[PDB]
RNA sequence: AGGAUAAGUGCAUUAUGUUUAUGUGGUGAUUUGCCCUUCUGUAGCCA
RNA sequence: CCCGCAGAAGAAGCACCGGCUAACUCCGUGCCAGCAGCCGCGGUAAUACGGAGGGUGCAAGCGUUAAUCGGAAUUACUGGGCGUAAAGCGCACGCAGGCGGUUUGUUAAGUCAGAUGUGAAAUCCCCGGGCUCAACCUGGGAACUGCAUCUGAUACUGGCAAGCUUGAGUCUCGUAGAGGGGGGUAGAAUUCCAGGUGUAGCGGUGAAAUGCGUAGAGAUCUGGAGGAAUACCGGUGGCGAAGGCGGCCCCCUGGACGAAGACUGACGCUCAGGUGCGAAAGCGUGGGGAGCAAACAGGAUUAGAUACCCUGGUAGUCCACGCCGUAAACGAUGUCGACUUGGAGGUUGUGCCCUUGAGGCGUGGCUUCCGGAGCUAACGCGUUAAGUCGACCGCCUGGGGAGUACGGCCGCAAGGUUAAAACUCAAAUGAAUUGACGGGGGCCCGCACAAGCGGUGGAGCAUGUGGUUUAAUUCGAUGCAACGCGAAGAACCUUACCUGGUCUUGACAUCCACGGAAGUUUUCAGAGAUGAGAAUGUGCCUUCGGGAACCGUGAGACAGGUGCUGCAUGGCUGUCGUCAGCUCGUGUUGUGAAAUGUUGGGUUAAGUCCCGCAACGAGCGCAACCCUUAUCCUUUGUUGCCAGCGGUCCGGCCGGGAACUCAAAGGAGACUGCCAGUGAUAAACUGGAGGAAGGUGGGGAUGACGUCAAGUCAUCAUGGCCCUUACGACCAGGGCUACACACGUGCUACAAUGGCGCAUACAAAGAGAAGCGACCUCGCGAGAGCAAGCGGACCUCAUAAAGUGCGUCGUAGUCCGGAUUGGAGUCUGCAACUCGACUCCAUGAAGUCGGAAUCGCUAGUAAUCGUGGAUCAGAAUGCCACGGUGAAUACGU
């Protein structure tokens, strides 16, 4: 009953509950929907939607599928090596190249999603929906768009890219 | 919310009661009044322990009250003294000369209104009730029993709007008419006002209880077949 | 005599599958929304 | 600015506490008052509100709006959007401007580097410095936000000359098509006329009426009239600039599609302004009118009926050009082009094929399905992009109000065209899940219908409901989910209701105080409560202080409360439904809401069972254990039974007997297991058979999660919260059950399957310890008081009735039904008048199987007759259960 994927640190962010409906089909029953996020330190793609008759069964459900089918993903400094814009279905999110000396800058449940991710210190503005559930894509998206060092010389940057298979 | 008559309808018919007596005609009355007076005032004076089912019985010249607990000879006392007035109230209350024995049920460390009991403090003090009910359940399931049916009621966790909750688990059949199992429903207010949990909770389908007596009455123990019959 | 591809025996309502009056507005279900991990960390929030 | 001297003195606000955003309890009122920067709230136990305690934050300040930046890629050159959310110009062609595949020559407008001059001061910024730090001010450096020219380069764009082809343009050859302009031409329905033949409906539609027609309609043969129109081929085809083009053919001519020979050689790209240009109707004149139609009338529909639907009927439709060209005026996607795995459809140049069927392969074509890399919020796109992009132009900045106003312009003329705000408002708007729902398409079930049979509704009665009435005729409940139900035995009591007496620890517990013991017998007053007197007794415990018991008296604490609120609640239960499905843990697919399972087919009481997709594992409904019956085995042998036998009137009453039912219980037997048909192999249904009995043997148990603000605070539990000389409590009387009727349910009749008369038969089950009860005496009968007896298989209710035997009866209220009413006799109790129940004598009405409406039932059922019981002071027409006699049919949805 598959693979799981661990940190050696705790997260249990829940983002989102939801209560589910058919209102005449056995009438309304109390099962709740939750959303909730399992990062790393350094980042995951792990995110995960799950349900139950209550809301502790279905957060440790949601807290369950946000660690199978997913992977950890890497990155050195508190900061990112690229000034690009991540995108992930209208919830779109900026970021460029910072100092050490600012940490987060954010707030709501989006400081607690950037940490882990390792993209806080390079925090730019989010367009578009940003509710709660589709907003805390930080640490997916913007780590499939990745940059992260590997290089002695500015101008080998892109020979040493090369040569990491050739 | 239909709630089906979930165990009156469902006795005698290999399923033991709680009262085990006969009386018949018209003093049937005197009897079963007389009978839930000594089960409120007895079960009142050995409330010093928790206790797990309550069995009252009236045969030919005797009154004897079994009773179950979570560790026997508690509800008994040191010495002797403690026991002979559990028996002094017996008689004052049913008119019978008296006995108690002690014993203990199937699962005696678990029991039905334990588990509401521990659900109910949680309401009583206005704190911790959104885990509680099912913390209570995982508890019961560690501790014994087949499955467990657990309803709450009330103003709960001291809102100022009523809810239903509940939570199930395992084998608890609704229709079963064979085995006794453990029934329990509390009332109890605070200072929000009322609450309460229904907890019904399923041993066995033919474990616990009466079983279906395998024989006639009519053949056994006769040292003598005939007291004439024409064969002599 | 080509109204003789004879139905290519390939044929079936063949392309709108339609019409005989209506009835106000909100309302159910909780005050811990809490029981997965070292270091880089988390749901009021922590190793 | 400093020293020394008194002294605790001389002194703190402001804003927050539902969420946005640093904080929660109680009281008040109960969508009211009042709060809101935004979001919004208030509808009872309010952390939104009003006040208080407490909690929180800033602080001699605090809090707050308008405005600027920023939050906001929502201020977007860096850095937004335009298929559908606001947003691609209506379309082609193209000057100015912006832009230029590729090479050589060449120039150096922009480009970039280098050089030099400039850019004072700190509040800002970086390094010092000084004033009690700081705020402040200031030296050196600087962002100094602004600016200059020379020298040099040519990688880059721009200028220019000659190519290149890798862009585009052009000739002949061929090919497809409804492109444009102008000509030609046939058959047949509607419509009409004529004559012939010929008689009554024809028409319209959901069904319908209005309409047309006997003056001869409709239809039919022959022959003429006339205009729009032209199938099927015709397709997702093809053409035109986009919208646009449709009978077939030619003339004049455009624009596209292919192929080889041949040529030119960036002649390129986009496009502000611009000129040019219409599906349709609008619309001027000319052509023309068979059918249909806004309007106008009339029908049909209905609260009407302008929508819906029809019928007459006109301009219009129908043709051509012409006037401002409207729109869903579109590869929905600007223009045009380069690049990116294909396959196939439609249909077409052309090479090749057995030309082997709109085909395949070779190589192009527009044009469409399908899906990969990549893209979307979803549908969807995907080589014709919505991919990767290119240049260059168009356009958008929340909604409504507005594609209007306003301005410029064009238009006989209505109009068109780009395109806005105050004000209003927290939304508006693209997409999709599941429930419900289609009147879109289709599937399924309960005795829910059917196949019938009977019942309520109509009569009368029983009993509940409302209407209506009084002192009051108490509520709760309102198809299915109220009405033989809470609230099953209702004179008062009951009991809510109403009135009259009477008292406040109080009917009841404990605790203090006083008078009577309670209990029993007994006269009396008053309504009875209550009291007085007589006679019996002075018990119980003890400090004989004093009290419990019953009753009166009194005080607190406290008892009591069909006290309100069922959006304040607990317990509890009704519905869908025996729906045939629902849920618990968990994975997966989507960004997700959530689905999936839990849905399909076939089969079922069934998540049962064959097949099968993301469902896997398990529980619920259902199956089971269960009690019961049926024969039959089996044991007991009375308070049960009797084949033979005795006493004997021939009765298990008793000597006696055990073949036998027979009672209550172990159970056996029957499993859709078999066989055959049916059924997708298959679950399983039906048939088949022996047998007491076959459909999961007959019966019963038996009903999921749960919305429904469903109904009870009135069993009972209970807070907030009110009375406690009372929203408690003792006593009598009155009323629900009145009567106007309607309404739910059930009862028994209207017949003859029945009633009557006479004669005649067999039960099952159960209830009786203040009770019923043989005998007894009394009694028209019911019953009465006494009592052996009883514990109910012993004794009694009990003559069980319908049914059976024979005769009888004809739709006449009878030969059915027997209500009312006079009048007598009875029950529990001082006390039966209205409100109670049963017996019996005489007379005698309503009612002919009841309309709208409407349900239950599959077999011990349904129907119908009696019986007992629960209830129960007193009594049943009901209910509940039993036994007598005991049915039609179940195709079909």
Known sequence: ?166 | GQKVHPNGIRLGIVKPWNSTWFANTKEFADNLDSDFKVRQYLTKELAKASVSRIVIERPAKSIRVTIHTARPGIVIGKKGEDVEKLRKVVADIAGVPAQINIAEVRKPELDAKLVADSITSQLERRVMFRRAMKRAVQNAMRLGAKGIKVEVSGRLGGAEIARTEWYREGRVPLHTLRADIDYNTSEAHTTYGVIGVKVWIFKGEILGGMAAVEQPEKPAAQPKKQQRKGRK
């Open chain 1, 1 to 166: 009953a598959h693979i799981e994927k661990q940190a050696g640190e705790l997260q249990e962010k829940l983002i989102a509950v939801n209560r589910v409906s058919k209102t005449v089909k056995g009438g309304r029953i109390f099962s709740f929907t939750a959303l909730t996020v399992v990062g790393d330190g350094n980042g995951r793609v792990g995110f995960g939607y799950g349900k139950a008759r209550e809301v502790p069964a279905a957060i440790q459900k949601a807290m369950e599928k946000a660690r199978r089918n997913m992977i950890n993903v890497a990155l050195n400094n508190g900061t990112l090596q690229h000034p690009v814009k991540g995108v992930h279905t209208g919830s779109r999110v900026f970021m460029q190249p910072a100092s050490e000396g600012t940490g987060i800058i954010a707030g709501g449940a989006m400081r607690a999603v950037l940490e882990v991710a390792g993209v806080h210190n390079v925090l730019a503005k989010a367009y578009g929906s940003t509710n709660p559930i589709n907003v805390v894509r930080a640490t997916i998206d913007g780590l499939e768009n990745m940059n992260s060092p590997e290089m002695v010389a500015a101008k080998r940057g892109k020979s040493v890219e090369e040569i990491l298979g050739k």
